[PDB]
Structure formats: C-alpha cells, structure tokens
C-alpha cells in the first residue's frame, strides 16, 4: 500500500558544478588513436547540476523528511549518486504518474531490479522502508511502499539472484535517453573518498541497456530507503547520519564534441566546440593542441530581427497583389523587406538619389538593387547589406596560456553582439575595451604604445603579442 509522509515544504535548491562529466560512447564503433568529432545530446562542460541530500536534518536537533521532488525530463538526464549505505533505490518515469498514462518503475528492492512498465497508481511519496532491528541488529526488514495497484503490463524484467542490503563512499553515474521508443540507460561505477560534491575528473560511460519502451516520458522521480519509523519518528539518529547520501541531476543538451579515442578504443578526453574561442579553434584544427598564430574559425553575420511589408494603397484583391497587410516602415536597422513583392534583407536609409518621376528601382552593378521607392509614401530610400565578416582567434601557444583575443574582420563594432543579458560568450560587458582597427574590431586584447618586432600579424600595421601577470596586447609594429 501507500503511506503519507510530511509535506516537502518546497526546500530551496543548492547548486554545484559539473566539471567535464558525462561523456558516453555515442556509437557502436571501435576506433583507435583517432580524434573524432561527434554531435549528440551531451551534458555541457562546466554546467549547473542541482544536488539534493537524501534526508534534510533542517533542525540541529533533527528533522527526518525525504527529499525526492518530481523533476522534468527534457531529452535526457545525467543522474549521479554518491552513497555509502545504498540509500537510493530506483526511479519512476512517466508523463502524468497516474492510471491514465503508462509508467516505468525501475526500483530494486532487496532481491532484484524489477523493471516494470505498466499502469501504476503512484502515491505522492514513494519509498522503501528498511528497518534495522533495535535488539539483534541482524535482520534488515524491507517493505516497498511505491504503488497502490499495477495493471496490465507491456514489459517485465526480474533478476533471479538476491543482493545483500565509515567514509567509503561510492559513486554511481547514469545517463537516461529516449530515442525512437528506445530507453537507453548508460552506467558507470567508481570508488571515491573525502569528496562531498562531484569530484574533479573525467569518466566515459558504457552503454548498459537499450530497453524497447516505445512510450513517452516527461517527468521522473527518485525512490529512497526510509530508515526510520513513520508511525513513531524518533528524535535523532533514526536516519543515516543526517541524510548523508546525495544525488545530483543535470539535463543534457544538443551539442558537438571533439572526442579523443586512445590506442585501446577507450574515450579519454573531450573538448566543447562551443564553450570559448580556444575550444572552437581546437575543433577547427581537429587537434587538441594549437600553436601560436591567427586562426580563422567561423563567420559572423547580423540577423534580421523583424520584417516589414509595403503594399499599395488600393484594394484590387503589380496591382493583383495577394491579400496581405502592409505594416509600418522602419529605418537604420537590418530588416527583411518586401516592397511590392520584391523581397530581400538589408538596412534602409534615406537616399539623396534624385529619382525621375517614372522610375522605381535603382541598380549600380546590374544584379543588385541599390535604392527603392516606397509605394504608399513615395520616398526614395537606399538599401545596404547590414553586416558580415570572419572571426579570427589570436592566440599564443597552448603551453603558455589559455587566454585568447577575437578579431572580427572588416566590421564596425558598434554593432557586434554586446550587452547580452548556446555559446553566448560575445562580450556582454565592455570590460574588454574593444577598439577598432582598419582590419576590424579586436576584442579581448589591450592597447599599448610600445613597439616591438611584431610576432602575430594582424593587419594594417597592427600586430599582437603575449606579454608579462601576462595577457594579450596589440601595438603598431616598428621596423627596428
């Protein structure tokens, strides 16, 4: 049956870092001494992971409630758990967690894992009560309290063998995905010591099972082992040393990754092609180490943030133009324009070109329209391609430092993406003190009057170098 526990009271979260964890073998291929580039669902490097304690002893004298909130499941979950007494037992997967929608129960009880995909009537607080005997302390009695009723299953797995029930903490990491009706569970196990949060390190995850589910999952829940008595909750020590066991949750995200396979075919290192400029250059060169110089990584273009339509001020259902509403007109901003059916993108400006009374367009190069006349308010306005360029990454060698500078070629940088609040690194703070050069806008490097035999050639007589504590500077080269 089901037994009610005290209300969760919506405890405020506490967060922690995920230092480069959660890289699993994406495919079923063997590679050796190859640096292979992949794109899939991964946990981003250096991400927020929210961590819950098993039993929150809120009062110093003792509180003995469970922390098992229902959390969203958005295209996969990285779930790590550190414990020393086997306190978490399993997970509940579903969409509504009632009798209306099918649900997966993966909890193990004392005997086996009992993977059960059925229609469960789940209660509010699921758990498995384990009681040490207060006298003999030899038999640990276990009683599940998960589902009131289970009906008409589409799957079942059981395990025949039985499994047995002060700082020897152990770390179990899992990744759950749902692709093409297949529930993929990847797993990994590792001993640890004297690390309360997620330790610094890397660990590839080996696929464990691909379960043919074919249902939807959107929410999931964690089931815990209740050491104490709900009928008679004790004052203290009823739980396991104040809910020491803990579990961390993070959400995957579509990302590319440069993945390093060693000689044995075991993944050992990884690199985010969307974390900071150095990593983008690493992915572009298809190597983990880069030498000093200037590398062109990608291209930058301003996107049109709105659309405008100007249709003639006559009904007539070109004069047979279809039914569409002519919106207002904007200027000095890269927009998508549609003038009398003529579509394009650009920035519009007031034009001084004296149009003759019968002319409509204007073209200087014979394949691009330069100016235009608005059909409703007949004013001449010219069109310019708003912006575009290439992004180069000034860097000294990867031995020296991981500081870089970014140069947008041949563009003003009163319009480079700034003050931002996906790799949204841009600047979002003018603490770099960008400054224009004839070659474009250079962001992240200092200006210095001193002149030296310039090492990294930038352009227009400007070269950059790494100087001593130490950072990047840009200066006009001297000839000696």
């Amino acid at each position, epitope marked *: 049956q089901c037994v009610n526990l005290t209300t969760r009271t919506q405890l405020p979260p506490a967060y922690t870092n995920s230092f480069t964890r959660g890289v699993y073998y994406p495919d079923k291929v063997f590679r050796s001494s190859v640096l292979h580039s992949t794109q899939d669902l991964f946990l981003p490097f*250096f991400s*927020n992971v929210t961590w819950f304690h098993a039993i929150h002893v809120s009062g110093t004298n003792g509180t003995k409630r469970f922390d098992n909130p229902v959390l969203p499941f958005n295209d996969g979950v990285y779930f790590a758990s550190t414990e020393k007494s086997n306190i978490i037992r399993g997970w509940i997967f579903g969409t509504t967690l009632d009798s209306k929608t099918q649900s997966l129960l993966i909890v193990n009880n004392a005997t086996n894992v009992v993977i059960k995909v059925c229609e469960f009537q789940f209660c509010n607080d699921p758990f498995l009560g384990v009681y040490y005997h207060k006298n003999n302390k030899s038999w640990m009695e276990s009683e599940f309290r998960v589902y009131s009723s289970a009906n008409n299953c589409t799957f079942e797995y059981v395990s025949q063998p039985f499994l047995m029930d002060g700082n020897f903490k152990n770390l179990r990491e899992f990744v759950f995905k749902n692709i093409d009706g297949y529930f993929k569970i990847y797993s990994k196990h590792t001993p640890i010591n004297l690390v309360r949060d997620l330790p610094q390190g890397f660990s590839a995850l080996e696929p464990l099972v691909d379960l043919p589910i074919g249902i939807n999952i959107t929410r999931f829940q964690t089931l815990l082992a209740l050491h104490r008595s709900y009928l008679t909750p004790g004052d203290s020590s009823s739980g396991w040393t104040a809910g020491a066991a803990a579990y961390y949750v993070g959400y995957l995200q579509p990302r590319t990754f440069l993945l390093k396979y060693n000689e044995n075919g075991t993944i050992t290192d990884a690199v985010d092609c969307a974390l*900071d400029p150095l990593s983008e250059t690493k992915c572009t060169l298809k190597s983990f180490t880069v030498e000093k110089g200037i590398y062109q990584t990608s291209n930058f273009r301003v996107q049109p943030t709105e659309s405008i339509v100007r249709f003639p001020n006559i009904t007539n259902l070109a004069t047979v133009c279809g039914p569409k509403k002519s919106t207002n007109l904007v200027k000095n901003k890269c927009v998508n324009f549609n003038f009398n059916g003529l579509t394009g993108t650009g920035v519009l400006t007031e034009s001084n070109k004296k149009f003759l009374p019968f002319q409509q367009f204007g073209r200087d190069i014979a394949d691009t329209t330069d100016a235009v006349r608005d059909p409703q308010t007949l004013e001449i306005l010219d069109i310019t391609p708003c912006s575009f360029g290439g992004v180069s990454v000034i860097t000294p060698g990867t031995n020296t430092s991981n*500081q*870089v500078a970014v140069l947008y070629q041949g563009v003003n940088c009163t319009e480079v993406p700034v003050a931002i*609040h996906t790799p949204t*690194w841009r600047v979002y*703070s003018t603490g*770099s003190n960008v400054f224009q050069t004839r070659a474009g806008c250079l*962001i992240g490097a200092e200006h210095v009057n001193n002149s030296y035999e310039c090492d990294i050639p930038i352009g227009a007589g400007i070269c950059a170098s790494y100087q001593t504590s130490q950072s990047i500077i840009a200066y006009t080269m001297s000839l000696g």
Partner: nanobody, 113 residues
Framework: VQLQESGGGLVQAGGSLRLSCAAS????????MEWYHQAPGKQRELVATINRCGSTNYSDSVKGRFIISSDNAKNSVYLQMNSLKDEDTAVYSCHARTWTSYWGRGTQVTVSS
C-alpha cells in the same frame, strides 16, 4: 560579466564590512577570481585569490582578518573583513578570468582613525 562589487564606504577602525562582487555569468566557468586594492599614492596590490578547484591564497597582510568565500546559490564571491585599520583605506576591485580578463569598477573603503 558586469562583475559589479557593492558595500564600500566609511567605516570605523576595528569594524567589519561585506562586499558582494556579483557576476551575471556563472562563476563555475570563471576559473579564477581575485581581489586587488589600490591605496592613495601607492600602486595596485593583490588581496586574495580563489580558483575553480578550490585552492585559496592571500597576500602577506591578509590572513587572519579577511577570508574569501563564495556561495553557489547566488553567483558571487565573498570577502568579509574584520578589524579594519587605516592603511586598508583603498579602492578595491575583483577580477575574473574566463577566457579574457574581466575587471570591475571598484569601490572605495575608508577607515576612520
């Protein structure tokens, strides 16, 4: 990262103060956050430093009175000071180095003695 720092002003000798160098970007990818100071008529000098792993360091005249902290609930680095004296009157700044160095505009700390 708009790493603004608030909490400066006038204090009495032997008092305490709190500064709240707070960053919009998550402090998990900062990889280094420090505090420097500039006294009137004297060049800039480091106060304290904390890196991503957890290593903590202070300059010679820093230990025992102010330590550096950071709570992973609102992204911020903390430097609370105890037993302030006259020569600690200076302008303080916090620096963070994600892939390019970021500085804040500092805050003035004056001690009455």
């Amino acid at each position: 990262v708009q790493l603004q720092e608030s909490g400066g002003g006038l204090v009495q000798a032997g008092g305490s103060l709190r500064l709240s160098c707070a960053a919009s970007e998550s402090i998990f990818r900062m990889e280094l956050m420090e505090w420097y100071h500039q006294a009137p008529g004297k060049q800039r000098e480091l106060v304290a430093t904390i890196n991503r792993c957890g290593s903590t360091n202070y300059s010679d005249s820093v230990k025992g009175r102010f330590i550096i902290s950071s709570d992973n609930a609102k992204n911020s680095v903390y430097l609370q000071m105890n037993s302030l004296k006259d020569e600690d009157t200076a302008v303080y700044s916090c620096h963070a180095r994600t892939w390019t160095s970021y500085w804040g505009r500092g805050t003035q700390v004056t001690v009455s003695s």
